[PDB]
Write a protein that binds this ligand. Structure first.
Ligand SMILES: CC(=O)SCCNC(=O)CCNC(=O)[C@H](O)C(C)(C)COP(=O)(O)OP(=O)(O)OC[C@H]1O[C@@H](n2cnc3c(N)ncnc32)[C@H](O)[C@@H]1OP(=O)(O)O
Length: 212
């Protein structure tokens, strides 16, 4: 029950975070749904990568249950010659590899520091999820406000969130973000042919940003 606390997520919390995301987050993602992604250990491992950056937050109720998370990573301004490690490289899951390959392609097509060339460090919002028993109560907004406190404490001015869902992008707009980059699924043809055709409201990847 409530009030809930908002706390820093520790690496120890990884199993509990994954359990929560399986019930409330992963199955709602449109690319996951389009591919009919089953149980996917690679997705779970990839989802936990931001935690050691020590800027991910959990909402925890009076029973000690995680009822919301906002997983965040830190993004440092790249040098022109830096090449990012391809996430899809060495992925063993063929369906999930297609998703990571698209993520790598977005990274090659758009650099957030082209929008913000004077910024040295940007906060990267990766996964925002709230328990379906506790939605409409402002938990997402308070998780986001906790990240604003991290940003103020550390001199970070820009919050970046990549969305694969039209509905996710609108949630971020309601939270005060704006779109800075779009790539339509209909235009993503890495080997000459379309790979993704999710349900109609989902037109493409939308990168959202907020100056805070
Ligand atoms: C980085 C990212 O992943 S972007 C974040 C998007 N995440 C997701 O889409 C995961 C699935 N959805 C969720 O986990 C949640 O619905 C969230 C995170 C989008 C919203 O969390 P909440 O704590 O409910 O946020 P909040 O209280 O502000 O409600 C947001 C809106 O959802 C609507 N809503 C109400 N009940 C529900 C429900 N059961 N499911 C979805 N949305 C609901 C509310 O009416 C509210 O509308 P408004 O913004 O016009 O006022």
């Amino acid at each position: 029950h409530m009030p809930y606390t908002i706390e820093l997520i520790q690496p120890e919390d990884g199993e509990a975070v994954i359990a929560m995301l399986k019930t409330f987050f992963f199955k709602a993602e449109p690319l996951n749904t389009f591919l009919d992604l089953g149980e996917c250990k690679e997705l779970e491992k990839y989802s936990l990568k931001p935690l050691p950056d020590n800027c991910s937050y959990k909402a925890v109720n009076k029973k000690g249950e995680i009822i919301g998370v906002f997983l965040n990573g830190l993004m440092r301004r790249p040098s022109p010659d830096d090449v990012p490690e391809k996430a899809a490289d060495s992925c063993e899951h063929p369906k999930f590899k297609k998703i990571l390959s698209l993520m790598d392609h977005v990274e090659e097509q758009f650099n957030i520091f082209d929008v913000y060339p004077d910024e040295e460090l940007i906060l990267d919002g990766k996964i925002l999820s709230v328990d379906t028993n506790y939605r409409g109560l402002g938990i997402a907004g308070r998780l986001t406000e906790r990240a604003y406190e991290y940003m103020r404490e550390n001199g970070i001015n820009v919050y970046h969130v990549l969305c694969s869902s039209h509905y996710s992008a609108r949630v971020m707009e309601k939270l005060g973000f704006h779109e800075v980059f779009r790539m339509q699924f209909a235009d993503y043809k890495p080997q000459g042919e379309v790979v993704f055709k999710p349900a109609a409201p989902h037109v493409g990847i939308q990168v959202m940003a907020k100056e805070v």
